[PDB]
Amino acid sequence: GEYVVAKLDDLINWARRSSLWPMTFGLACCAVEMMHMAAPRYDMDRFGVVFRASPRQSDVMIVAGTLTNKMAPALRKVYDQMPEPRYVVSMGSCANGGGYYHYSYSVVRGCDRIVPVDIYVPGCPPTAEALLYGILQLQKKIKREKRLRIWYRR
Amino acid sequence: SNLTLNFGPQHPAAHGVLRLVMELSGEMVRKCDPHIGLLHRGTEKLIEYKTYLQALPYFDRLDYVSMMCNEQAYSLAVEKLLNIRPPPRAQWIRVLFGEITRLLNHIMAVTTHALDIGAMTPFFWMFEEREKMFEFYERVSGARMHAAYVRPGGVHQDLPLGLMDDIYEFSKNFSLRIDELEEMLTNNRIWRNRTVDIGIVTAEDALNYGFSGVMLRGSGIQWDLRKTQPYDVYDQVEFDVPIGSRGDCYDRYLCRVEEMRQSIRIISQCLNKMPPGEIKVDDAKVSPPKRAEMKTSMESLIHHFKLYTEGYQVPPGATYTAIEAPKGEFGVYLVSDGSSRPYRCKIKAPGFAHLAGLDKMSKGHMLADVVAIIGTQDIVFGEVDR
Amino acid sequence: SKVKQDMPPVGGYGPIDYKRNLPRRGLSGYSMFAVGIGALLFGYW
Amino acid sequence: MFMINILMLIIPILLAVAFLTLVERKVLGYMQLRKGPNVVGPYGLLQPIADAIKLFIKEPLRPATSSASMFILAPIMALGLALTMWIPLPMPYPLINMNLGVLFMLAMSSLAVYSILWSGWASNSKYALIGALRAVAQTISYEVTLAIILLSVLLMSGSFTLSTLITTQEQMWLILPAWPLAMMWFISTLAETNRAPFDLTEGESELVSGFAGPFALFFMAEYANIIMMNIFTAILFLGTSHNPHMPELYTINFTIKSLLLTMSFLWIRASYPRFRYDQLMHLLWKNFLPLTLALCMWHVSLPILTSGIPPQT
Amino acid sequence: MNLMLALLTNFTLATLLVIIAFWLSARLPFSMKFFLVAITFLLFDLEIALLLPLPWASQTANLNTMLTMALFLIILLAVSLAYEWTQKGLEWT
Amino acid sequence: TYKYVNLREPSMDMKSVTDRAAQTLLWTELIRGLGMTLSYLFREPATINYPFEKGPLSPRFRGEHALRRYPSGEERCIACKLCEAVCPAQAITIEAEPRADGSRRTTRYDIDMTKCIYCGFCQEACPVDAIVEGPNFEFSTETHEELLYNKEKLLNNGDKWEAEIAANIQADYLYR
Numbered sequence A: 001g002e003y004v005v006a007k008l009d010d011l012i013n014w015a016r017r018s019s020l021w022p023m024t025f026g027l028a029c030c031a032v033e034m035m036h037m038a039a040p041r042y043d044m045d046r047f048g049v050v051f052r053a054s055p056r057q058s059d060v061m062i063v064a065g066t067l068t069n070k071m072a073p074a075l076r077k078v079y080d081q082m083p084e085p086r087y088v089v090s091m092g093s094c095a096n097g098g099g100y101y102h103y104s105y106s107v108v109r110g111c112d113r114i115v116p117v118d119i120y121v122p123g124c125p126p127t128a129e130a131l132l133y134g135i136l137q138l139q140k141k142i143k144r145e146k147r148l149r150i151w152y153r154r
Numbered sequence B: 001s002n003l004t005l006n007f008g009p010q011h012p013a014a015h016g017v018l019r020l021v022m023e024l025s026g027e028m029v030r031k032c033d034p035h036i037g038l039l040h041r042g043t044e045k046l047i048e049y050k051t052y053l054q055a056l057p058y059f060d061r062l063d064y065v066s067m068m069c070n071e072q073a074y075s076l077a078v079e080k081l082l083n084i085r086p087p088p089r090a091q092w093i094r095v096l097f098g099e100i101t102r103l104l105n106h107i108m109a110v111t112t113h114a115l116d117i118g119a120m121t122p123f124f125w126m127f128e129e130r131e132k133m134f135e136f137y138e139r140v141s142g143a144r145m146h147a148a149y150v151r152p153g154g155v156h157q158d159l160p161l162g163l164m165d166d167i168y169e170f171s172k173n174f175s176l177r178i179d180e181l182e183e184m185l186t187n188n189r190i191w192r193n194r195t196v197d198i199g200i201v202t203a204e205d206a207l208n209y210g211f212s213g214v215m216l217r218g219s220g221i222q223w224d225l226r227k228t229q230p231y232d233v234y235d236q237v238e239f240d241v242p243i244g245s246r247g248d249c250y251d252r253y254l255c256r257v258e259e260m261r262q263s264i265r266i267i268s269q270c271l272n273k274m275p276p277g278e279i280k281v282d283d284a285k286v287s288p289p290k291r292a293e294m295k296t297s298m299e300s301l302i303h304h305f306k307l308y309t310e311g312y313q314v315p316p317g318a319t320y321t322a323i324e325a326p327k328g329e330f331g332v333y334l335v336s337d338g339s340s341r342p343y344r345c346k347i348k349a350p351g352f353a354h355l356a357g358l359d360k361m362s363k364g365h366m367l368a369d370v371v372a373i374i375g376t377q378d379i380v381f382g383e384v385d386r
Numbered sequence C: 001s002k003v004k005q006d007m008p009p010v011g012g013y014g015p016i017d018y019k020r021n022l023p024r025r026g027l028s029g030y031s032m033f034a035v036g037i038g039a040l041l042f043g044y045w
Numbered sequence D: 001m002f003m004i005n006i007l008m009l010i011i012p013i014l015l016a017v018a019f020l021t022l023v024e025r026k027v028l029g030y031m032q033l034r035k036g037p038n039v040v041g042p043y044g045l046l047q048p049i050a051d052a053i054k055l056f057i058k059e060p061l062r063p064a065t066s067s068a069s070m071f072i073l074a075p076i077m078a079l080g081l082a083l084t085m086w087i088p089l090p091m092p093y094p095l096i097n098m099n100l101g102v103l104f105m106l107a108m109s110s111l112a113v114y115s116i117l118w119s120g121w122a123s124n125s126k127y128a129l130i131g132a133l134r135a136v137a138q139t140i141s142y143e144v145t146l147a148i149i150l151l152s153v154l155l156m157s158g159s160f161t162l163s164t165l166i167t168t169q170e171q172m173w174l175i176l177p178a179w180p181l182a183m184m185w186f187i188s189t190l191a192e193t194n195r196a197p198f199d200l201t202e203g204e205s206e207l208v209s210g211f212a213g214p215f216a217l218f219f220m221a222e223y224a225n226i227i228m229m230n231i232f233t234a235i236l237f238l239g240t241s242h243n244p245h246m247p248e249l250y251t252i253n254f255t256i257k258s259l260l261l262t263m264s265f266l267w268i269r270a271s272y273p274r275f276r277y278d279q280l281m282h283l284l285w286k287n288f289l290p291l292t293l294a295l296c297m298w299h300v301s302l303p304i305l306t307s308g309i310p311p312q313t
Numbered sequence E: 001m002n003l004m005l006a007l008l009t010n011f012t013l014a015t016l017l018v019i020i021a022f023w024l025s026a027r028l029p030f031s032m033k034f035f036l037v038a039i040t041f042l043l044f045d046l047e048i049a050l051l052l053p054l055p056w057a058s059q060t061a062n063l064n065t066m067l068t069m070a071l072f073l074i075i076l077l078a079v080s081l082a083y084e085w086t087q088k089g090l091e092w093t
Numbered sequence F: 001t002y003k004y005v006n007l008r009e010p011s012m013d014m015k016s017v018t019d020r021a022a023q024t025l026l027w028t029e030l031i032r033g034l035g036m037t038l039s040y041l042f043r044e045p046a047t048i049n050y051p052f053e054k055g056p057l058s059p060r061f062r063g064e065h066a067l068r069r070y071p072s073g074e075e076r077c078i079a080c081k082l083c084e085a086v087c088p089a090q091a092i093t094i095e096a097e098p099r100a101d102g103s104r105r106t107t108r109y110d111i112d113m114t115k116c117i118y119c120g121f122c123q124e125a126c127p128v129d130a131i132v133e134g135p136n137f138e139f140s141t142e143t144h145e146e147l148l149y150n151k152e153k154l155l156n157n158g159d160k161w162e163a164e165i166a167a168n169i170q171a172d173y174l175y176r
Ligand SMILES: CCCCCCCCCCCCCCCCCC(=O)OC[C@H](COP(=O)(O)OCCN)OC(=O)CCCCCCCCCCCCCCCCC
Pocket: B189, C036, C037, C040, C041, D180, D181, D182, D183, D184, D186, D187, D233, D237, D268, D287, D288, D291, D298, F024, F025, F026, F027, F030, F031
C-alpha cells in the first residue's frame, strides 16, 4: 500500500511533467522571447512541451506580458476553463508585479491578483533561456507532488 | 450574424490580443469592429512623470519587435528640441542597427504572417536568424530585446571589438535565407491563393485613411521617409524602395521581402563606411561623461550627478518627429515646458491607423481573409494601444 | 597608445549578396508532358 | 486461433498510432531545423507513453452535452470503425478474405462522418454544430472523387477483392498507367482525413471565439485512418510482389512503402500553407471532379480498345 | 461467423476504452449553400452506385452496348456538374 | 530610387503557355517546395542541449542585481541615492544613516525585482560601482515575495557572484 502509492505518484508525476502542453497568452513583449523558446535554438517541443495546444487541452498557462484591467476578466475565464491539473507560469516583470507600468490606472499589479501562480520568471523580458529554466523548474515542482500519498493517508 | 475572432492563435504568437467583433452574411464579412485597448497601459501618462532619460525605455516596449527604431525616433525628437547633434559614428551605428532591426521586424512580420495562414516551417528557419541578431543586440547593450541603446545624444556605448566582423558573417549568408523563404511562399499557388487580390486598397484611400510604410507602397505610392525626409546618415547610403502595383496582400508581402534584401544592402554599406570617433555628443550637459572622467574631474562628477538625478532640461517647445519604422511612419509629438520632464508625449503608432482601416480593407472578403489582412498590416498591439 | 576601436578591415569587407536568386530548374512543359504521356503509354502497354 | 489473430491486429495498430505521434513530431522538428522529442526516453521513445498517461488521468472538461446517449456514441463509432477498416487488408493475407473487400471499405468509410455529426449535436453549441457541418460537407465532397478514382483503377484489376490488386501489379505498379489518378487519389486522402493543407477544422476552430480521454480516443481513430489510407494507397498503386513461400518478404516491402507514404503526409504538412474553405471546395468540384469524370470515361474505354480487359477471377 | 466476431471485438474494445476515458429546434442560420452541397453529394453518390458494377460489366459479349451505356451514364454525370456550375451552384460568395 | 516587385507581363507564346499549363497540372512549383523542406531534414539542427549547454552571452549582459564590495570587504555603496533617482520603474528604495563608525552607509536597500525593467540605469548612475546587474538569469522563484530583495539578499548576491562580476567589469569598463 505505502510502497505502491509512492511508485504510483512517481508514474503520474513523470507523465504529467514529461507532457506539459502550454497555453500562452502572448499579451506583449515577453511573448517574443516565448516564441524564441519554441524556435530551433531551444526547441521547447523536445522537452515534451508542444507548440500549439488549445485552452481546453492545456496543462500550463504562461502569462507572457502585461495584464491590463480590460484584459483581466478574459484571462480569468480562460484559467477557469482549463481542465485540471492546471498550472500558471508568470513570465516577466509586468505579469510578475506590474513592472514598468505598476503605477498605471489600467494595469493589474501582478497577474497573481487574478490567478494563482506556480512559477515567477523574472526579467523584462526574461531571456528565452530564463523562461526555459522556469519551465524546467515547474517540472521539478510537479516531480515533488504527492497526491496519492496524501490521499492514502486521509 | 455576429462572431468574435479569438484573442490569438493556438500556437505561440507575439503581437498582442485583439477582440474583433465581426458581422457576416454566409461566408462574407459585412463589418469588422476592432475592440482594442486590451494592451493599453497608459504609457503616455507615465512618461509625464519621468525625466527624458527615464522615458526612453518606454519606447522599446511599444513596437516591441522594432526596439531600436522606436528608440531612434524618440532620440531624434529630443535631440531636435535640445538643438544638439549626435556624433557621426553614432549616426552610422544608429542606421546600422536600424536596418538590423528592420530585418528583425520583417522576419516576424512575414513568417508569422505565413504561420497564421498555416505555413509554419519558415517561422522556425527564420527565427534562428533572429536569434543571432538578438546576440548583436545583447553584445552592444547587454539585452537581447529592450536595449535602451539609442539615446538622445548618440548611443550608450561603443561597439565591442569584434562585433562588426560577426555582423558581416551573418549578413554574408542572409540573402540565401531569404531565398529559402521565397521558395516556400513566392510562387506557391496556395500562398498566392491566400494573398493575391486580398485586402486591396487604392492609393487615394490609403492616403486619406492615414496609412504609411508598406501600406502606401503596396498601392504604388512612391514614398519612403528615409528618402524624402532623411535622418541620421540615410542620405549617404544607396538602396531602392520596393513598390507594389496591385495594392493587395501579395504585393505587400513582396515589398517586405524586398525591403529585407535592401536592408542587407544598406548594412553592407554601414559596415564598410563606419567612421571612427566618439559615440555620444561631446556635451556633458546632455550626455553623461565617461566613468573615468566622472571619477577624476569635479565638473564631470557634478554633471554625472545632475544628469542622473534631475536630468537635462529641454528648451520649451513642441516637435512632431517621425521616422520610417519597419511598420510605417512612427512619430512622436513631444511637448517640452522647459523642465527636465516632458510635458506631453503623444506617440503616433503606424498600426493605429492601419487597424482602423481593417473594416474598409475586409469588405466583401471571407472570414479567413481577415486573418491574412491583419497579417499584411503587421500589427503589434503594444504600439496600437500604448 | 593608439586609439583602438571596432573598425572595418583595411580595404573593407568583401562583397555581400542580397539580390533574389531562385535558380531555374526542370524541363520545359513540352518535355514534362512528353515524359508523363510516355509513362502512361508504357503502363498501358 | 482467430481471436489471437484479431488481437495481433488491433493492439499493433494502437501502438503504431501511439508512435506515429512521436515520428511526426521528430520529422517535423528536423524539417524545421530543430530536434523534436528527445528527452522523455532515449530519442523520445517514451514520449507517446507519457502523453497517453497524461491524457487519461486528465480531468474531463465537464461539458454537459445535450445528448448523453450520443455524446458517448461518437467516439465509439469513430474508433470502432477505424479498427474495422483493417480486417480486409492483404498484408499479404487478410484477416478476412472478402470477395467484395473494396466495397466493404468504401461502405465502412462512408459511415465515418456520422461521428463528426454526432459530436456536433452532442456539443450543445451553435458554433460547434456549424463547424461539424463544414467538416461533414468537406468529407463527403472528397468521398465523391475517391469512389470514382477507386472504380477507375478497379477496371484494370477486374475485381472488388483486395488480393486481386496484388496480382494486377505482379509485373508493374499501377502508378505507371494511372499516375494522374494517383495524384488526385493522394490529395483526396489528405482532404478526406482533414490533413494539412486541408486541416480546416483545426484552423477555423483556431479562429472563432466560442467554437482529454475522449480527445485521445478521437485522435487515435483519426491517426489510425491516416495509416490505413496510406496502406491502402500502397496496395492500390504500389503493389508489392507476393511470394507464397516467403510471405514476410512481402510484409517488409509493403510496410516500408506504407511508412514512406505516411511520412509524406508529415512532409506535406511541413511545407504548405492552409487552403481557404471555399478554395478546397473549388479544388474538388471544379478541378478534381471534372478530371476524375473524364479519366473514369478514359479507363472504361482503355481496356476495351487495347484488348486488355482483366478477368473476373 | 468470423466477420461478426471481428466486428464485435472492434466495437467492444471501443466501448471499453471509452468507459475508462470517461469514468475510470429552430432554423440554424447555416446557409442554403451547405444544404445544396449535401444534396449534390447524394445525387452524385446515387449515380456512383450505378457505376460500381462496371468492373464486372466489362466481361460481357455485348461490349458495344456496355461501352455506350457506361459512357452515357458518366456523361450525364458530367452534364449534371456542368449545370450546377453554370447556374452558380458551386460559388461560395 | 525605386523598383517594381510585381510588374511582369507573362509571355503568351504557346511554349510559355504550355510551361504554365505543366506547372498547373503537374504541381511542379509545389514539388519544388517539398525539396526545400527535404533539404532541411538532412541539415544539422540548431538546437542546443540546455541545461548542459548554454546560450552565448557577453560581459555586458544585464541579469540579476548584486551589491559589491571593495577588496577590503567594505561596502562600495555610500547611500548617494543616484540609482534610486534614475530607476525608471521606481524599483529601488533606500534609507541611510551614519554608521557606528560615522560612515555614510545604507540601512535599507531594496529592489523590487517585479518592478524592475532590468535596464541597467542604476549601474550606470552608480559613482562607485556598488550596484550592478550580474550575469545570473536563472533565479525564478515559486512565490512573489521571493522577488522582493532587501539589502541582505543583494549583499549575498554580491558575495556569491563577485568572482564573475569582477571579471565581467574588467572586460567592459574601458567601453564605459
Ligand atoms: C494517349 C492518351 C492518354 C490520355 C490520358 C492523358 C492524360 C493527360 C492529362 C495529364 C495531366 C493530368 C494531371 C492530373 C493531376 C491533377 C491536376 C490538378 O487537378 O491540378 C490542378 C489543381 C488546381 O490548381 P490551380 O492553381 O488553382 O489551377 C486553377 C484551376 N482553376 O492544383 C492542385 O491540385 C493543387 C494541389 C495542392 C496540394 C498538393 C500538395 C502535395 C503535392 C505533392 C503531391 C505529389 C503526389 C504524390 C502521388 C502519390 C501517389 C501514391
